[PDB]
Design a protein around this ligand. Sequence first.
Ligand SMILES: *[C@@H]1O[C@H](CO)[C@@H](O[C@@H]2O[C@H](CO)[C@@H](O)[C@H](O)[C@H]2NC(C)=O)[C@H](O)[C@H]1NC(C)=O
Ligand SMILES: *[C@@H]1O[C@H](CO)[C@@H](O[C@@H]2O[C@H](CO)[C@@H](O)[C@H](O)[C@H]2NC(C)=O)[C@H](O)[C@H]1NC(C)=O
Ligand SMILES: *[C@@H]1O[C@H](CO)[C@@H](O[C@@H]2O[C@H](CO)[C@@H](O)[C@H](O)[C@H]2NC(C)=O)[C@H](O)[C@H]1NC(C)=O
Ligand SMILES: *[C@@H]1O[C@H](CO)[C@@H](O[C@@H]2O[C@H](CO)[C@@H](O)[C@H](O)[C@H]2NC(C)=O)[C@H](O)[C@H]1NC(C)=O
Ligand SMILES: *[C@@H]1O[C@H](CO)[C@@H](O[C@@H]2O[C@H](CO)[C@@H](O)[C@H](O)[C@H]2NC(C)=O)[C@H](O)[C@H]1NC(C)=O
Lengths: 344, 344, 344, 344, 344
Amino acid sequence: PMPPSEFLDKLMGKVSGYDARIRPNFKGPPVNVTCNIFINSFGSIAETTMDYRVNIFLRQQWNDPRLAYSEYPDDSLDLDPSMLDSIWKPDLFFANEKGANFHEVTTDNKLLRISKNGNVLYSIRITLVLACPMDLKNFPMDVQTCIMQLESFGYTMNDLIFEWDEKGAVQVADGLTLPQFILKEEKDLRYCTKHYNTGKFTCIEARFHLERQMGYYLIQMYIPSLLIVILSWVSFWINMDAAPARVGLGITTVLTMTTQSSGSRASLPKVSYVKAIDIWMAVCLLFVFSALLEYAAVNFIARQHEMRKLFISRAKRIDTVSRVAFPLVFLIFNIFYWITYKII
Amino acid sequence: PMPPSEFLDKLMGKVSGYDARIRPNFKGPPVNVTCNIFINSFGSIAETTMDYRVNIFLRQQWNDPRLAYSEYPDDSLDLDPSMLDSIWKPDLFFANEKGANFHEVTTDNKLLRISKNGNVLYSIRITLVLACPMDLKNFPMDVQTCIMQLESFGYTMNDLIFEWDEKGAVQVADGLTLPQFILKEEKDLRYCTKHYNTGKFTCIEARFHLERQMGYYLIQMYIPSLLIVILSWVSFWINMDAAPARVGLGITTVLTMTTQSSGSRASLPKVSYVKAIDIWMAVCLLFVFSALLEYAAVNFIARQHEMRKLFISRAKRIDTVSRVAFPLVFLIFNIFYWITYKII
Amino acid sequence: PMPPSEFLDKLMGKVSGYDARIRPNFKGPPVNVTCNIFINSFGSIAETTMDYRVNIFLRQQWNDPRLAYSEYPDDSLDLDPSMLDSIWKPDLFFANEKGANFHEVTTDNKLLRISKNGNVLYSIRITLVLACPMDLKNFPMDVQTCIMQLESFGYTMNDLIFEWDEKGAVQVADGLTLPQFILKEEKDLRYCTKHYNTGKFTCIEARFHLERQMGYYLIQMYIPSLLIVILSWVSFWINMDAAPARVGLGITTVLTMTTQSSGSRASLPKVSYVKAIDIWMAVCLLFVFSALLEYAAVNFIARQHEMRKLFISRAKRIDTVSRVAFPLVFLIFNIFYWITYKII
Amino acid sequence: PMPPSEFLDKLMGKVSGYDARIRPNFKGPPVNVTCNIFINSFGSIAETTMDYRVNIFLRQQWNDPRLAYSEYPDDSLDLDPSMLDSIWKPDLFFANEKGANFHEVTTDNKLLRISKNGNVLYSIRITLVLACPMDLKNFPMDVQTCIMQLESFGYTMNDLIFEWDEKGAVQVADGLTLPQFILKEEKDLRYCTKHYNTGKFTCIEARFHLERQMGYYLIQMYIPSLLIVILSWVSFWINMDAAPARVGLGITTVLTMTTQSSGSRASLPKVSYVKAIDIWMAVCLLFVFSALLEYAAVNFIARQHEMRKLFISRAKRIDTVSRVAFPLVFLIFNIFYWITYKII
Amino acid sequence: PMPPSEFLDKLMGKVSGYDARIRPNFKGPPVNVTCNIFINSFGSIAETTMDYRVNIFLRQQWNDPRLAYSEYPDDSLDLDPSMLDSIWKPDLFFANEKGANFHEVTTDNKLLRISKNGNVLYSIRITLVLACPMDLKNFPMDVQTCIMQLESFGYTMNDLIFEWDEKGAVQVADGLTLPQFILKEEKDLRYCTKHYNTGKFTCIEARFHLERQMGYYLIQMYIPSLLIVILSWVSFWINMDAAPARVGLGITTVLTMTTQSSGSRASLPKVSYVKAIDIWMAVCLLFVFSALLEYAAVNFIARQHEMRKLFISRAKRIDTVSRVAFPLVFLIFNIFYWITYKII
Ligand SMILES: *[C@@H]1O[C@H](CO)[C@@H](O[C@@H]2O[C@H](CO)[C@@H](O)[C@H](O)[C@H]2NC(C)=O)[C@H](O)[C@H]1NC(C)=O
Ligand SMILES: *[C@@H]1O[C@H](CO)[C@@H](O[C@@H]2O[C@H](CO)[C@@H](O)[C@H](O)[C@H]2NC(C)=O)[C@H](O)[C@H]1NC(C)=O
Ligand SMILES: *[C@@H]1O[C@H](CO)[C@@H](O[C@@H]2O[C@H](CO)[C@@H](O)[C@H](O)[C@H]2NC(C)=O)[C@H](O)[C@H]1NC(C)=O
Ligand SMILES: *[C@@H]1O[C@H](CO)[C@@H](O[C@@H]2O[C@H](CO)[C@@H](O)[C@H](O)[C@H]2NC(C)=O)[C@H](O)[C@H]1NC(C)=O
Ligand SMILES: *[C@@H]1O[C@H](CO)[C@@H](O[C@@H]2O[C@H](CO)[C@@H](O)[C@H](O)[C@H]2NC(C)=O)[C@H](O)[C@H]1NC(C)=O
């Protein structure tokens, strides 16, 4: 017959009255648009900005009865992306965009095909920088739910409804992993229908659950803080007469733990509430600060001058108890700490 | 009848003489444009740049009597965003833009509908990076008023007037919170009418009051500075004969407080005036510097050599007074400090 | 009569022969364009890049005799910004642009009106990132002259001349302040006429004098460096026999002044010449380094072993002189330093 | 004859029915497109982002039988880049784009020529920021394979197939080197054919093997960590009675190795697994921490008080063994460390 | 006569057959394009990226015999920049672009004039971020040659040849200086003709020699490293019995030189080879590390216990030699260091 781009010009042209400014089934039931995404890339999950960059394929399927055809023999017509301003498309957008763009290198990365019954598959490649509010109450032990929601801008609910398709509404690429997180397989899919003073608009959202990787923050924060707590415990085996030894040991431990506690929040939003690393670095600062208060008690009691034999023997007694007591209380703190942030 | 995009072409076309270059009620009363915003996102409130990024819906309502219609049956006509260059729109802009853009992903995020009496609702999605001058006289205890003001660029006051609508002129999204601030519910709305050598132009502004969250700067700055002040107080329980103990303790405290004071302004504009954290870190540096001056007085008096018994007894006297005096003066400073920055 | 956009089409149309590609008074005297700017914002004055971002209104006034009219009743015609490609405009640019853009949000922020005698006022909103070479010979005590110059790109001097208007050629917004600088009221306005191998082109420039704010760099740099110099002076009251006290005091002062001197240039261009903060941090490093050389002289002379009584008495003599001499020489340095950088 | 741009208009025009929306050999065998790249620049290989920027020439060759000609005398026709919207081109894209753009300065950097048999050579200049997932199990001793893959967006496999040409499918510029890597000559070239719910699409990929340069991380990380381990060994030659000497030596070594271990990951993604520099900095932290535990054993045993002669002689024995044992165990660790990361 | 824009329409129009898609002297000798640049700005010479930003005027001169005219009286015709798509222009580009853009503020910054014999001067303003590979073998003492090369993209050598003009092919603006470099007056100009599998293309390049400024890196790196080497020399005047004095002095010097050596490469590419600052900071680290090894030899020999008088006298002997030997070997190193990096 005739080539399919010229058959498709006769289906959009001024003859037969196709208008791309007018939705299908006009003055009728609303247009059902079913959607699924394919996640190509996922990452750069910043927390100062509380956003994340994603790279998706956005597929949209609806039915335009004006685009049905029976003269042409074959079952689909790929419309060229140069001619996409000539058919109706839904005005989908993302309610938490914070910036987005198309991909237009070597060709506009757009795709459209029309079936004989008028089904329109429309797939485009988008980069999004989506805004998700972080919750950092238990910071290395948290699960983050970063969402993405797909709305209509102009058409209200009586004109256009979005749905997810039941055949796998969110696909993820095969070798897509994350450096700081893992992405769970189960993904929540529900409705987020918005009301304004203009009207009610359709909205569908997808929730992605991100569990952090534990092993980074152990190496940088938990293990070096635990060694300085042990470093304060070797003061209890040094002689009492070595005054600049046991004093200078407690000085350097209590101010490196001040340095370690500052760098524990070096890449974080300035939230007001306390978090799980903040109650680690505060309690571990309490051990290295009370280990130096132990020697100030030993240095004061032993210089109380039989009055000299009773003073040395009493100050020797606290130095035997504190060799047992401080690794015993720090042990029963690590029980109550790690059990609390494993059951939660 | 006929489809509404073709009815609306006859209302904008060369027949009946609609010109999009000419305001409504021309050579008459000025055009009353009433406006309200809907804040989607709000954040990245930088203070080096003294700006903030916002994401809004900007709704504008005016009346064009040329756009009234009575033939068409239904009560509103949604103009398609491809045809927005064909009607008159006000030339609103933001007097403190510092950069702005539209959102054009999957569709231009624009919306326009026309009522039968000629009312035009026009809503667009904008990202703004608005400039607000910070005032940091009492820096963790301040309330910041960051404004946004909406002006006319070309039309003067006799041609076009902006107003806020009385039915909630600033709406905020439901779960919109801030990491470092809270946004108060009451929002000032007043006029900011500008005069130039060109004419007088309409301006309406909205004021947003941002109160900081206290709890961040306690954990990083106030509490670690307070421990080093206590760390200088354990020198008064160490023996006088331990010279490298009490000297080396006062050295390390006075130079970590120098380090803590530098990082207190690590993310701030280089303002000339003194602020509330600067008078904390200066006075707390005075305690750790005068605690080391106490031992230099003890070390000088005790080496004055009955001449030896009077010198040891006098230098012992100041070491008993300073165990009481320095936690007593630092206590009555924290009364006068925190009362001053709670009443203000 | 007829609406003014259609009267203005007849004044630019193919009838009557108006060509926007041809300057006014062609083959005649040069076009006199008078200019003034209105500074909306001013700031982000970087010194690594040696630039500054400004936000201006650029008003241009010239006379086109082809645009004179007498049929129309009223005295001015606002041309719509959609039709600005249809009249002649001067090809002004900035010789130190380093990047610039227009503002096009909700409308192109452009403005044009034509008087009956043919005067054309043309105002546009521009953001510029203008390049100014810094001079940092006396860095906290300097006055910076950052310029902006306005040239013609295509038309030579015999075709087009730029001028400033005598009625306030540079206006500044009312509440426009700077965090690190102040902007003086008097602004130089002179000519910067360029010669190339193409021709001679018109240029007008405006000079803005920026005096720094003193009070920032006192708090961060001068005052903490002055305390470490005093911290080296308490070594002269500590006993000579306390060897790790007076040695360990001079060690920690001389290497924190090394740390303080590195951070004094943390946000500066890597200029080769010496500056006023560099001769502060070098001389203040000389006091804390010679205070430790004082004890190495005391420790060597006192161990020369009547031979023991003469050695202790001679080494005691330098420790009495240096308690007076080092705060006396540092006092007469601060006289010669601050007088030099107040008279300059 | 006639000029070649007018001969080429008759080959694309409405006469003879050339349609740029329709692939060659339509309703026939698929279009074979053979490709090769020329790498101009290569670098900025970030690992926080896990991407790399490349600058390429992308040459594509296919055959359009509609573009064959025999009237014109000469053997090739360079189509001008202004007229590239008039012929068919493949819709190639990059499956790991993460941002890309064209080069359009002084001319669109595009090139197209057509042979007499209808072969179309099409070369364009592209900048890409391609995403490659890093694997950092053995971080200074790793080989990274960063890929780039070239897909079809709209045409499925039955319509369009990509191939590499057998005559050098990846050329690299002559003096192209890397600061942190070397680029091996052998480059893998294989197929990456994608399946979606839309269809199967062609994909060819090229693999680039990047071996790091060893010599940087020796100078900054391995050598300064090895000196602090030696710095802990001079404690075994200092006298036992010098308590603040041997204690204060072990304090400062164990907390600079904490500082050196933090900066070893200062520019890295926050991966959970352990890497080769992490097992260097942990074991080297174990030597400087057990060298201080050696003196705490010496200080405890020597103060056990013939009871005094046996205690000094036993604590002297461990100080002779540890002068041999600690440089002997650190020597046999460096054998097992560097052999493991040379055989892998 | 008639206005020159209408005379120039008749010279480009469909009458007389001017085609902008066809080069001058077609099917003849190649087009000789002579070029010169005018450097407005120059700077931001990054070395992590190994690039530099420049701001130029690019003037191009060729001869089109189709553009010769004799009817018009005056000797040149300035074509308006709105009509630049209507004449032929060469497809120049930069082979090391790494990003570039035009300047389009208040007018496209473009310029074109045509003489009576058909000479076409074409000048445009470009910002470039050109890629130059750094060579850092002798880093503060190096001369960098950063090039820029100008190629043809589509036309081969038989169609288009680039040349520099002999009358000053590279001009630099008058007050253009650099903060970290100086720009030598003599500039190399030679050919860089490229061969591909497509053809051979013309290329001309210009070489700019950049000599660094010495005086920055003396103040930050060489002088503070030299003081810590002197700071290790005052240990040789402190008494041997002061064990925490001479030990704690050598500890703090050897770990600040570790800190100073890390910050010496804080803004550098991670190159594998050693450089001139790396052999300064390594040798200066060897002096402060061997000064602490000197005391460990003194502390071991003096505790060997006539056996006590011989041990003190031998350990006193090395402390007299090392007061002379270490400032003597560091003096003869600074001779061999600075002579080597002045002759090279
Ligand atoms: C879009 O989908 C829904 C159902 O999935 C359809 O809405 C219903 O249509 C039936 C009959 O037309 C009515 O009985 C219902 O009242 C409608 N609403 C609901 C919630 O079930 C709708 O017709 C579909 N639109 C199109 C064009 O097919
Ligand atoms: C816009 O609103 C104002 C009032 O809200 C109108 O301005 C007044 O109009 C009345 C009668 O037309 C006059 O008596 C007043 O002098 C006007 N000014 C004020 C300050 O009240 C104006 O007419 C409205 N414009 C339109 C098109 O409706
Ligand atoms: C632009 O302004 C200058 C004067 O401000 C005019 O130039 C002078 O014009 C007069 C008479 O036309 C001559 O006597 C002078 O030689 C001109 N030059 C100078 C330096 O005074 C010029 O005519 C004005 N151009 C227009 C269109 O008005
Ligand atoms: C593209 O290349 C392949 C071979 O390189 C061609 O595909 C084969 O064509 C032959 C005969 O046409 C068939 O026998 C084969 O079944 C085809 N497939 C394979 C895998 O060999 C193809 O014809 C070429 N397309 C064009 C337009 O030349
Ligand atoms: C461009 O310049 C070169 C010389 O500068 C010209 O090329 C030569 O032309 C002459 C006579 O036409 C020949 O004898 C030579 O063989 C050519 N090549 C060389 C290397 O000298 C060329 O003709 C000029 N092109 C134009 C249009 O003038």
